[PDB]
Amino acid sequence: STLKGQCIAEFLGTGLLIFFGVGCVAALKVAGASFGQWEISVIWGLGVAMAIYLTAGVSGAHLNPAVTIALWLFACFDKRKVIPFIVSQVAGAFCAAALVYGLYYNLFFDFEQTHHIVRGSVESVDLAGTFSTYPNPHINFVQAFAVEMVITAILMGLILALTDDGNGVPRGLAPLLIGLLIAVIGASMGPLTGFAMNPARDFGPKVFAWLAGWGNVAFTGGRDIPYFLVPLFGPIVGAIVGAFAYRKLIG
Amino acid sequence: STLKGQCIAEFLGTGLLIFFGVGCVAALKVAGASFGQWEISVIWGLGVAMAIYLTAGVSGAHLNPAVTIALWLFACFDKRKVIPFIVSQVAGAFCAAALVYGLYYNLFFDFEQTHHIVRGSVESVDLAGTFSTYPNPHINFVQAFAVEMVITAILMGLILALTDDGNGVPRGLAPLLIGLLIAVIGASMGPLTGFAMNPARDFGPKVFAWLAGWGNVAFTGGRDIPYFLVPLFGPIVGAIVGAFAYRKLIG
Amino acid sequence: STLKGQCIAEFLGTGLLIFFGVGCVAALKVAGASFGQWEISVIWGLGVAMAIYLTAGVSGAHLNPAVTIALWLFACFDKRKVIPFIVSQVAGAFCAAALVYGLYYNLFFDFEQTHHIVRGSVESVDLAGTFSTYPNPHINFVQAFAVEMVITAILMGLILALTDDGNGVPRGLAPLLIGLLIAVIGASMGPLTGFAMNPARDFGPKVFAWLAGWGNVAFTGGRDIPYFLVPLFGPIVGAIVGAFAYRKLIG
Amino acid sequence: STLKGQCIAEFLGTGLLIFFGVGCVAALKVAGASFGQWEISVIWGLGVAMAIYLTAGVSGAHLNPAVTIALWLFACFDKRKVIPFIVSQVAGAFCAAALVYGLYYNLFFDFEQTHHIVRGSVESVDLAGTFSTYPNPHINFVQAFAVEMVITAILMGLILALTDDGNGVPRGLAPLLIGLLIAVIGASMGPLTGFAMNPARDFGPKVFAWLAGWGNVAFTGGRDIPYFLVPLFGPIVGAIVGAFAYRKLIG
């Protein structure tokens, strides 16, 4: 597979997981669907598994800039493909957020008119939480960064544990096992930071929310310190830590 | 296997998935069962997986006219079997809707008498939603068609991705993975159009609802433009788009 | 394996599935646990899968008199083992119901004193529904028998479909797939008759409920026609129909 | 693998399952997350499966002192590694409880101030139930011990049933099947004693709760007889019984 073919697969794979994840959150927020914390988390994980199954044979199904950087540093992934892979991942998440917004277009405006929410204000951040993740009100930037580092380290460590020959896990079952890992992470740590674990999953839809009319509050989240840095660099630091720990303690 | 044997398998396979899907919706609506959006979606998906496991060895387990048309256009499926397969699929969905109605017969009339609902009126469309799918009140024909096209394209693309040699997915695990894909599609996009994704799944029970006493509102759904066209031609267009995209970008 | 060894495995396997199924129903009824229809059904199915995994290698993991009779009539199962297998299955369900009652002993009496329920009365049938299945108030004996026949036919047909060489289903994955089939059956048809599908699962705990103090209402269920016949002979008729249909239409 | 390498794997594996299990309970209690009994149980089980997948190749993934003792007595596990394995398991559960407390630090104090709960009192035992298990108010020490013995015997018996060559279960699917077994055990027996089934899972976080400020009530649980003995010796007795029963009746 050429570089162009793998970039398209990364674009489609990241878009597919964003389409399922944002869609279910949109259904809970503006469509009146009844979802619990476990149900939302299991939709995110299974959507990732389907995205991996679709694009594993072409590009390896990274679908995460943090995973792409960690693989380059620790799994001898080609450095020439690092930038195009990351660009394709963010582009796929951005376009998928636009597609979900288009399908839920009439419900978003009906929700705003009913609750008298003006887009771009602090009170509109909750609606902006459909696309991207925002921290719990009781935690700050430092605690939010620690949560993102820890959960991404677990994800990176288990990905290496589930995708190494000799561990007994079939290659056909590994994508499903990865999705279940994301579900329990989101179920146990989601109410804190939104279990982003993916710079593309957060930055992409955040750019669309800024263009959709939410303005600066899409990036800052109503906080003095702009929150968008936590899902951007937090997973990157955590992925490196998780990959380093696995090679030292398990691998 | 002869053509008659495959048609019977398609009749039973489509009926089995309708029996599980309509039954769970009936339990939520007239039996007082507590179901969320994810729970309803996961029953639909797992019911499809069981139907595929039962009939895969005989007819290939299409169980969807949109999939049958897409396979004929892109997977060299025999054209002589296209019409009998589609006829058997719609017949199976029709008979299964009648069977579910017979088992839930006393609960349907008790529900109508309690809520003073006259069958065949606009207020009875919600009860008619047990058998077939109807759009969200905030979306119209054009947006409903777009939703059905997109979700069927994802289903068709993943079906080809999950049923090709060399992708590493075992043949015994593919039917279960297909069902999980339907669950997340229904969880993320269900509150919009009912995630029909299957012309037989919608048209079949719709004909029974018309015969059961709902009349013309079973097809139109209380809309000026008859809604039944969206689940009829929407999945067909989406399946072709999804199959074409997979061959160009992934396959 | 000798006959004594297989009878012990059938005794333990049926007891294990009753222990999980009755325990979760007891938690919902007297322990205040929050369970939906899907959640209860998925506990029953997964408990059956664990029971099959434990006893498949010894006795074949029938754990159902209806399945045992159907296998003898259609799968050349030994007739000399039919009676001891059925006796062991009912004995295992009876003892497991007693064990669950012992663990939940203090909660059952606290529930009765709080709600002023006298054991053995018509108002105590709901508490007796913890151990065995009772019909929906809007359905009668004839409709209850039809529901039990249909769902057991689907279970028997899929069991043959999931346990035949050449269908591509691994032997290690078949028990889990069987449990998921039970979950969707209970989710879609449970609110009607309790998805017994197993004469031992119902008759066994019913005998214990009669001995525990519920008296005659444990068998009759407060109905003029004794309801206990429906889960006794209903699954037996359905299992034969399902096995016959599979051999004629699929097998 | 040397003894030091296996001890680290046991430390990380037990910590990983505690991180997921305590985190989801913390989200339900202090973060306002909506969780049912099945949802909490399925997070515990799947977290165990991920922990097994990470550490099976190094130390065998015991992650339970009761399992370690049972394997030494019945599976010829090395006696020299029994003490270091148990020490590592309790250490991992202790550190993971501290990590979860640190991430949820601000939410715990906000919950206490809102409800006017003084740490170390009887009314604070419910908050202490986030880390460790405490019995249902209607059951006493004797019934709590019986529940822990029975459920651990089932877990030990199924673990031997799922990890023996010749049973047809793939080695890659066994960890997932073990997690599903824990989910149904917690769903059916959790509202009684908290389905500890693991001396490290309970004693470890209990020591942290005592150090975190809960004092003596973390061990006694507000009972005249200290409850901490039930999850300590209960699973050990049950694991031996379950292993002995499997070798006599199934193995």
Nearest by CB to B33, from C146, C169, C191: name it.
C191
3-state secondary structure B147-205: HHHHHHHHHHHHHHHHCCCCCCCCCCCHHHHHHHHHHHHHHHHHHHHCCCCCHHHHHHH
Q: Which residues numbered 140-179 in A keep a CB inside 8 Å of some CB on D?
A: 143, 146-147, 150, 154, 157-158, 161-162, 166-170, 173, 177
Q: How was this structure determined?
A: cryo-EM
Question: Has B201 been labeled as part of a binding site?
Answer: yes
Closest C-alpha to B53, from D87, C10, A210, C246: C246
d(CA A124, CA C194): 46
String of b and e for A57-77 (b: at least 16 CB within 10 Å)? bbbbbbbbbbbbbbbbebeeb
| D174–chain C nearest CA distance, Å | 9
> What is the spatial distance between Cα C29 and Cα C8, in angstroms, rounded to a whole number?
31
User: Are C15 and C198 within 8 A, CB to CB?
Assistant: no
Rounded Cα distance, B227 and B145, in Å: 9
Instruction: Find, among D207, D232, D233, D235, the residue nearest to D219 by Cα.
Output: D207
Q: What are phi and psi of A46, to 5 degrees?
A: -65, -35
Please compute, for residue A174, the number of CA atoms within 13 A of its CA located in the half-sphere on the CB side.
22
- What resolution, expressed in A, was reported for this entry? 2.3
Cα(C21)–Cα(C15) distance, rounded to whole angstroms? 10
Q: How many angstroms separate the CA atoms of B79 and C60, rounded? A: 43
Burial tier of C113 (Cβ tally within 10 Å: 0-12, 13-18, 19+):
exposed
Tokens of B177: 């993975």
Measured between alpha carbons, how far is A251 from A154 in angstroms, rounded to an integer?
A: 14
Kindly provide the b/e burial profile for residues A10-44, where b requires at least 16 CB atoms within 10 angstroms of the residue's own CB: bbbbbbbbbbbbbbbbbbbbbbebebbbbbbbbbb
User: What is d(CA A104, CA A30) in angstroms, rounded to the nearest whole number?
Assistant: 8
Q: Which of D24, D40, D165, D178 to probe the A interface (max A CBs under 10 A)? A: D24
Maximal CA-CA distance, chain B? 58
Distant-in-sequence, close-in-space partners of A46: CB < 8 Å, separation ≥ 6: A20, A179, A183, B180, B183, B184
Distance CA B142, CA B163 (A): 32
State phi, psi for B111 to the nearest 5 degrees.
Answer: -65, -40
CB B55 within 8 A of CB C192: no
Counting as contact any 3 or more CB pairs under 8 A, the partners of C are B, D
B200/C contact by beta carbon, under 8 A: no
**Which among C21, C29, C36 is positioned nearest to C112, based on CA atoms?**
C29
Question: Does B contact D via 3+ CB–CB distances below 8 Å?
Answer: no
Give the closest residue to D177 by CA, choosing from C43, C107, B214, C50: C50
The distance in angstroms from the start CA to the end CA of chain C is 29
> What count of CB pairs under 8 Å joins A to B?
111
Contacts of C64 (CB under 8 A, 6+ apart): C14, C89, C197, C198, C199, C200, C201, C235, C239
Residue D237 Cα distances to C50, D203, D233, angstroms: 22, 16, 6
Does the annotation list B196 as a binding residue? yes
* Residues, chain D: 251
* Burial B169-203, CB ≥16 within 10 A → b, else e: bbebbbbbbbbbbbbbbbbbbbbbbbbbbbbbbbb
Using only the alpha carbons of chain B, give its radius of gyration.
Answer: 17
Residue listed under structure tokens 């460790």: D132
C62 assigned to a ligand binding site: yes
Is A181 close to D43, i.e. CB distance below 8 A? no
D139 and chain A: CB distance < 8 Å anywhere? no
Measured CA to CA, the distance from residue C169 to residue D170 in angstroms comes to 13
- The residue among C236, C234, C201 whose CA lies nearest residue C17 is C201
DSSP per residue, A179-231 = HHHHHHHHHHHHHHH-----HHHHHHHHHHHIIIIITTHHHHTT-SS-TTHHH
Whether C227 and C219 have beta carbons less than 8 Å apart is answered as yes
Burial A188-218 (b: 16+ CB within 10 A, else e): bbbbbbbbbbbbbbbbbbbbbbbebebbebb
Angle, CA of C87, C89 and C95, to the nearest 5°: 100
Cβ pair B136:A107 closer than 8 A: yes
Give how far Cα C32 sits from Cα of A29, C107, C127, D24, D190, Å. Answer: 29, 10, 13, 20, 11
Distance CA(C180)–CA(C191), nearest Å, equals 18
Q: Is B127 on the interface with C (CB under 8 A)?
A: no
Separation CA C25–CA C33 (nearest Å): 9
Which candidate from A8, A54, A106 shows the least CB-CB separation from B157?
A54
Question: Distance of CA C152 to CAs C160, C171, C241, D99, Å?
Answer: 12, 22, 9, 49
Q: How far apart are CA C19 and CA A185, in angstroms?
A: 30
CB contact under 8 A, B147 and A106: no
**Euclidean distance between CA atoms C229 and C69, whole angstroms:** 17
- B184 within 8 A of A20, measured Cβ to Cβ: yes
DSSP states along chain B: --HHHHHHHHHHHHHHHHHHHHHHHHHHHHS-----HHHHHHHHHHHHHHHHHHHHHHH-----HHHHHHHHHHS---GGGHHHHHHHHHHHHHHHHHHHHHHTHHHHHHHHHHHTPPTTSGGGHHHHTTTS----TT--HHHHHHHHHHHHHHHHHHHHHHSSTTS---TTTHHHHHHHHHHHHHHHHHHHH-----HHHHHHHHHHHIIIIITTHHHHTT-SS-TTHHHHHHHHHHHHHHHHHHHHHT-
Whether the Cβ atoms of residue D63 and residue D9 lie closer than 8 Å to each other:
no
- Closest residue in A to D54 (Cα–Cα): A161
Residues in C touching D249 (Cβ below 8 Å)? 5, 8-9, 12
Cα B178 from Cα D32, distance rounded (Å): 34
Interface with D, mutate which of A28, A35, A38 (most D CBs under 10 A): A38
Name the helix (H) or strand (E) containing C180. Answer: helix C174-193
Query: Distance between CA atoms of A83 and B146, rounded to whole angstroms?
Result: 33
Q: Please tell me the distance from the alpha carbon of residue A106 to that of residue A110, in angstroms, as a whole number.
A: 6
Closest CA to C14 of C76, C83, C95, C118: C95
Q: Which of A9, A20, A106 sits opposite B188 (nearest CB)?
A: A20
Chain center to CA of D226? 18
Round to the nearest angstrom and report the end-to-end CA distance of chain D: 29
Which residues make Cβ contacts (< 8 Å) with residue A208, sequence separation at least 6? A94, A97, A98, A101, A131
Whole-angstrom Cα distance, residue C61 to residue C53? 8
**CB-based contacts of B127-130 (< 8 A; 24+ apart in sequence):** B127/B29, B127/B30, B127/B214, B128/B209, B128/B214, B128/B217, B128/B218, B128/B221, B129/B25, B129/B29, B129/B194, B130/B22, B130/B25, B130/B26, B130/B29, B130/B30
Q: How many CB atoms lie within 10 A of CB B249?
A: 16
Q: How many residues does chain B have?
A: 251
Instruction: Write down how long chain C is.
Output: 251
For chain D, the C-alpha Rg in angstroms (whole number) is: 17
The token duo for D51 is 């922990």
Calculated CA dihedral for residues C14, C16, C21, C26, nearest 10 degrees: 120
What is the C-alpha separation between C221 and C193, in angstroms, rounded? Answer: 12
Q: What is the largest CA-CA distance in chain C?
A: 58
H-run or E-run covering A15: helix A3-30
Interchain contact, B184 vs A47, CB within 8 Å? yes
Work out the burial of residue C151: count CB atoms within 10 Å of its CB; fewer than 13 is exposed, 13-18 middle, 19 or more buried.
buried
Half-sphere exposure of A52 (CA within 13 A, CB side): 24
Domains and CATH numbers, chain C: 3-249 (1.20.1080.10)
For residues A94 and A200, give the distance between their C-alpha atoms in angstroms, rounded to a whole number: 8
* Angle of CA points B76, B81, B83, to nearest 5°: 115
Q: How many CA atoms lie within 13 A of A218 on its CB side?
A: 20
Q: Based on the number of CB atoms within 10 Å of its own CB, is C165 exposed (0-12), middle (13-18) or buried (19 or more)?
A: exposed
> Which three-class secondary structure state does DSSP give residue C234?
helix
> For residues C49 and C184, what is the distance between their CA atoms, to the nearest angstrom?
14
Chain D residue numbers with beta carbons less than 8 Å from the beta carbon of A147 are 103
Yes or no: say if A63 and A52 are a contact pair by the CB < 8 Å rule. yes
Report the C-alpha gap between D55 and A251 in whole angstroms.
10
Q: How far is D202 from chain A (nearest CA, A)?
A: 18
Q: How far apart are CA D219 and CA D227, in angstroms?
A: 6
**Could you give phi then psi for residue D188, rounded to 5 degrees?**
-95, -25
| Cβ–Cβ gap A177/D176 under 8 Å | yes
Handedness of CA B211, B213, B216, B221 (dihedral sign): negative
B208 contact partners, CB below 8 Å, separation of at least 6:
B94, B97, B98, B101, B131
Return the structure tokens found at A4: 């162009």
State whether C12 and D250 contact (CB < 8 Å).
yes
- The number of angstroms, rounded, from the C-alpha of C243 to the middle of its chain's C-alpha atoms is 18
State the DSSP H helix or E strand holding residue A64, giving kind and residue range, or none if neither: none
* Cβ contacts of D216-219, under 8 Å, gap ≥ 24: D216/D120, D217/D120, D217/D121, D217/D122, D217/D124, D217/D125, D217/D128, D218/D128, D218/D132
Chains near D (3 or more Cβ pairs under 8 Å)? A, C
Q: At what angle do helices A37-59 and A3-30 cross, to 10 degrees?
A: 170
